[PDB]
Amino acid sequence: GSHMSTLERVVYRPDINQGNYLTANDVSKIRVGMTQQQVAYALGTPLMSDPFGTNTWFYVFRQQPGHEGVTQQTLTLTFNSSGVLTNIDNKPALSGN
Incomplete structure (x- = not known):
């Protein structure tokens, strides 16, 4: 993107060069059936810093080659009324960032 x-990365926490956000590894960590608080802690609370405010969470995939028009794959976490994981929606991202 423009930025x-x-x-910025808070501190030296090496793994990915392409971001300081969630990756595929941590997506593999989570699983449907647990709550928002569970995932927020497993995954890491989203940019807004308040995961318990929404029912739709947006995350990113690990450092990948991006061999298409779109490169990344976004994780969209869907929670039911109770705040329980119903679906892990992993679909392609924007064509960039």
Whole structure:
């Protein structure tokens, strides 16, 4: 994106170079059946910093080649009325960032 500067990262926490957000590894960590609080802790609370405010969570996939028009794959977590995981919606991202 326009804000290409990836200098901010809070502290030195090496793994991915392409971001400081959630990746595929952590998606593989979670599972349907647990709550919002469970996933928020398993995955890491989203940018808004308040996961328990919404029922639709948006996350990103691990450092991948992006061999298409779209590169990334977004994780959209869907929670029911109770705040329980119903579906892990993993579909393609924007054509960039």
